[PDB]
């Protein structure tokens with residue numbers, strides 16, 4: 001059957017699909033038309049229906065997997081549209097992770113003779129992350145950081161080597177946030193999590209601005225000034241709070257200037273969008289910092305699709321983690337950050 | 353002069369005023385009419401102007417302070433109205449803390465010959481907290497907790513002894529949040545803080561519901577169902593996430609159900625108010641838990657005026673801290689929780 005791994009999250013389904021490129025003359029004959037139809041449908045289209053997208057820039061080319069050569073593809077669509085996906089399927093052994101592997105188990109079994117194997121999401125995350133870093137991103141680094149994140153005229157994306165990846169703090173920013181401490185390939189734990197994640201950004205942003213997509217929320221945020229909504233240390237002290245080394249620009253109270261009616265009446269949608277992004281991002285960084293200090297881990301890698309096409313939040317994490325840790329922690333990022341669970345699920349295929 | 357301590361915060365001014373009750377016959381003669389006017393104005397009124405309030409239930413009666421007996425009064429008004437207060441004053445040595453002791457220093461000096469002594473807010477907090485617990489609340493405990501916070505038919509306020517108060521984690525919930533680690537009477541530090549505090553509750557609540565006061569925000573929240581806005585673990589998994597011991601009722605994504613337009617169209621203002629309260633309160637508890645674990649401190653005391661007339665948030669903190677710490681941390685509360693800085697400032701009077 002086709003080789004897939006699927007991560008069904010609260011918001012997005014992520015699918016990794018291995019396309020064989022070493023099909024022999026005989027193998028092409030002994031392939032049933034439905035399979036050929038699936039393969040050409042997936043490789044000849046970049047949009048699937050109205051909401052499915054293949055992230056072509058992420059494709060791993062000429063990967064050797066399970067003794068075959070092929071291309072590894074990365075595909076996403078909203079969990080809300082999983083009924084369409086399953087209905088297309090009713091027109092295979094499926095390794096699946098994420099909460100939806102449990103929630104929609106019975107729905108996947110409406111596909112006759114389909115074998116569903118549920119795999120744990122944080123176990124799939126770690127395996128897929130380590131795997132993709134190991135094979136490289138088509139010879140480039142999978143992992144990167146922002147050099148000189150405190151100086152904007154210097155701040156720039158730079159590769160980071162994870163050849164000895166342990167220990168590692170993994171911050172998975174999906175709908176919510178899970179924080180993992182990875183000590184070895186088989187020794188890892190979920191430290192804690194936070195409820196203020198990507199779904200909070202998008203949910204609050206939609207309530208406050210009427211935006212109707214993640215991308216629109218980011219576009220608004222890019223044009224806004226969060227300090228129109230937030231109360232800063234300098235709004236309370238008139239300057240820095242020197243005694244505890246708090247700079248005047250630090251946010252003392254997120255949305256704290258919105259207690260004044262006249263400020264609520266002058267704030268723009270874009271300002272609110274940016275304050276929402278800054279609020280969520282700073283809280284993620286601060287929780288990550290506290291977990292890193294507690295776990296005695298100085299490398300903090302951020303994954304999940306909150307950071308997809310979201311350089312604002314990545315740069316804010318890079319600057320804030322370095323600034324508030326006095327340079328003791330470094331923020332790391334991965335090119336395939338939304339897809340590690342799906343890859344880890346695909347990697348469980350030989351166990352079945 | 354009258355004995356005052358003042359804490360000028362980002363949102364509220366808190367004032368502690370010592371009323372002597374041992375005035376002798378001669379002392380009453382040698383008292384100038386303006387002073388007599390101030391004392392009778394403060395003791396014969398409970399509302400001052402349109403926005404000042406004396407919290408009569410908090411009064412400490414027949415306290416011995418600086419070798420005199422008197423009553424200690426607790427008074428609050430919005431920082432926005434400090435210009436009115438200063439203008440009334442222009443119709444004394446003032447010990448003052450909070451960010452506004454710095455920001456409004458020049459304004460206080462418009463009162464002729466007034467000596468302003470700025471004192472550090474976290475230093476005043478610790479001194480005032482330890483002092484009030486030491487003298488008791490008119491013979492009752494200043495400190496309390498909620499017994500059996502996990503069972504609602506049993507949950508009840510109970511006194512807690514702080515006679516050896518160290519070590520102590522103090523979580524000061526004002527506009528934002530400061531977290532203090534107190535190891536002794538003279539050994540304490542600010543561990544960290546969070547920007548998601550009382551001003552975030554009130555600012556977001558006002559944006560989302562149009563409420564026009566803290567009390568109205570709490571009244572709305574009391575009638576709402578936060579699960580109409582939040583995405584829970586059971587919304588993602590269909591039940592518990594057993595592998596990591598996450599119950600189905602845990603919030604996976606605050607406001608995470610608001611990414612769906614039809615849910616934004618059915619959610620009530622009250623639901624949004626409660627989701628705002630729950631979001632802020634859970635984040636405060638979770639940050640407090642992480643700091644307590646890092647500081648190796650198991651007693652966590654919550655202060656500041658976010659918790660004033662706010663039993664919902666107190667009970668949520670009590671339950672959440674006990675539940676998520678598996679009973680290793682206990683949430684503590686103080687009857688005079690908004691006023692410790694003002695008291696600590698008053699206690700610095702003999703140094704000048």
Ligand SMILES: Nc1ncnc2c1ncn2[C@@H]1O[C@H](COP(=O)(O)OP(=O)(O)NP(=O)(O)O)[C@@H](O)[C@H]1O
Nearest residue numbers: 009010011012174175176198199214304305306308
């Ligand atoms: N096209 C998109 N649609 C929706 N959300 C998007 C999109 N692109 C990025 N995001 C963001 O990515 C988040 C979801 O990230 P993701 O890692 O896929 O979480 P999930 O796995 O679906 N949720 P979870 O069950 O908590 O692990 C959303 O909350 C948004 O902030």
Ligand SMILES: Nc1ncnc2c1ncn2[C@@H]1O[C@H](COP(=O)(O)OP(=O)(O)NP(=O)(O)O)[C@@H](O)[C@H]1O
Nearest residue numbers: 361362363364526527528550551566656657658660
């Ligand atoms: N009458 C009220 N008016 C405004 N806020 C209130 C009131 N009663 C309670 N609150 C809450 O109490 C918070 C302020 O608490 P408080 O401890 O007085 O902070 P502050 O000292 O003024 N701010 P900060 O400079 O950060 O220390 C507000 O954010 C509200 O959530």
Ligand SMILES: N#Cc1ccc(N2CCN(C(=O)Cc3ccc(C4CC4)cc3F)CC2)nn1
Nearest residue numbers: 250252282285286320321324528529545546547
């Ligand atoms: N990555 C990462 C990362 C990102 C942010 C972060 N912060 C920790 C420090 N903060 C704070 O104390 C926020 C704060 C709260 C209250 C006050 C009172 C007026 C005195 C002042 C005041 F500043 C702000 C948030 N930590 N880490």
Ligand SMILES: N#Cc1ccc(N2CCN(C(=O)Cc3ccc(C4CC4)cc3F)CC2)nn1
Nearest residue numbers: 176177193194195602604634637638672673676
């Ligand atoms: N006092 C105190 C206190 C209050 C709350 C608290 N929480 C820590 C545990 N939380 C979490 O992991 C929140 C969370 C995030 C993501 C997910 C993913 C679907 C799997 C699931 C998921 F549950 C919730 C917040 N901790 N302490």
Ligand SMILES: [Mg+2]
Nearest residue numbers: 009010098174
């Ligand atoms: Mg996920």
Ligand SMILES: [Mg+2]
Nearest residue numbers: 361362450526
């Ligand atoms: Mg204060």
